[PDB]
């Protein structure tokens, strides 16, 4: 596979940005990692075939690398808790840094892409595609938590960022009163999703596995959590007016790598169409 890894450089992070790239036309399909993202391989490359996948689908590959704990979010200040030495500032590496070297260099379209996340950048590919639809006419969000803000939400989110690296979700949305809870929150930014008219494309099991594996207790568990808040998500994007989504919701499924490879598969056909065709 002609896979290459590059490195972006970020002005507002102050680093540079590892990439994983495949080639294969002039749109492309963001591939975000999960909560444990890690600063050599993307996950989806660590474990899943998505590049030879999507090898030949007219589409080409793009995979940050890198992002631990960070909701690939512009955060307010560094995380106050690891010593981390700089702010994150990934909303603007996905949509201004990053498109502009790869438009460049590569002859990558900044615009008509797919930002498809997982787990924790479930929800951030649908709040890229409700502030930026012009770059992300097409976003899928797969075990994604898309309530953010909502109840116990902000506190378990709280506790996983310091379990996975010592992150501080305060320093990234401030207090849960700040406006950038609500303004990140799927659930509330329906209305743009609706009326961006953005397909979207959401899934998330409900915590039985099936053959693929992921059977184990904590990935059943946080697959039959966070599938209360994609049912009520479908019920409310149905409400507000949503006509142009597809949920996913089988009687199968942890919170695991198989069940998000499949579903990458599932929705190359439906990319191919909204992007090119």
């Avoid at 609500?182 to 009326?195: E, G, H, T, Y």
Wanted: charged share 15%; proline share 8%; glycine share 12%.
């Amino acid at each position: 596979l002609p896979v290459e890894y590059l490195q972006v450089p970020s002005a507002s992070m102050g680093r540079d940005i590892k990439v994983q790239f495949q080639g294969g036309g002039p749109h492309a399909v963001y591939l975000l990692d999960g909560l444990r993202a890690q600063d050599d391989y993307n996950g989806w490359d660590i474990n899943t075939p998505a590049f030879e996948e999507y090898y030949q689908s007219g589409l080409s590959v793009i995979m940050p690398v890198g992002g631990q704990s960070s909701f690939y979010t512009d955060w307010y200040q560094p995380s106050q808790s690891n010593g981390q030495n700089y702010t994150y500032k990934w909303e603007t590496f996905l949509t201004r840094e990053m498109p502009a070297w790869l438009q460049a260099n590569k002859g990558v379209s900044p615009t008509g892409n797919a930002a498809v996340g997982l787990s924790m950048s479930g929800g951030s590919a649908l709040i890229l595609a409700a502030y930026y639809p012009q770059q992300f006419p097409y976003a899928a969000s797969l075990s994604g938590f898309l309530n953010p803000s909502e109840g116990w939400w902000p506190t378990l989110i709280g506790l996983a960022m310091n379990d996975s690296g010592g992150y501080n979700a305060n320093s990234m949305w401030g207090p849960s009163s700040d406006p950038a809870w609500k303004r990140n929150d799927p659930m509330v930014q329906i209305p743009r999703l609706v009326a961006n008219n953005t397909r979207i494309w959401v899934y998330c099991g409900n915590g039985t596995p099936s053959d693929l594996g992921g059977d184990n207790i904590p990935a059943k568990f946080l697959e039959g959590l966070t599938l209360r808040t994609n049912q009520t998500f479908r019920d409310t994007y149905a409400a507000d007016g949503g006509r142009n989504g597809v949920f996913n919701f089988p009687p199968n499924g942890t919170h695991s790598w198989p069940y998000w490879n499949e579903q990458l598969v599932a929705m190359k056909a439906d990319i191919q169409h909204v992007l090119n065709g």
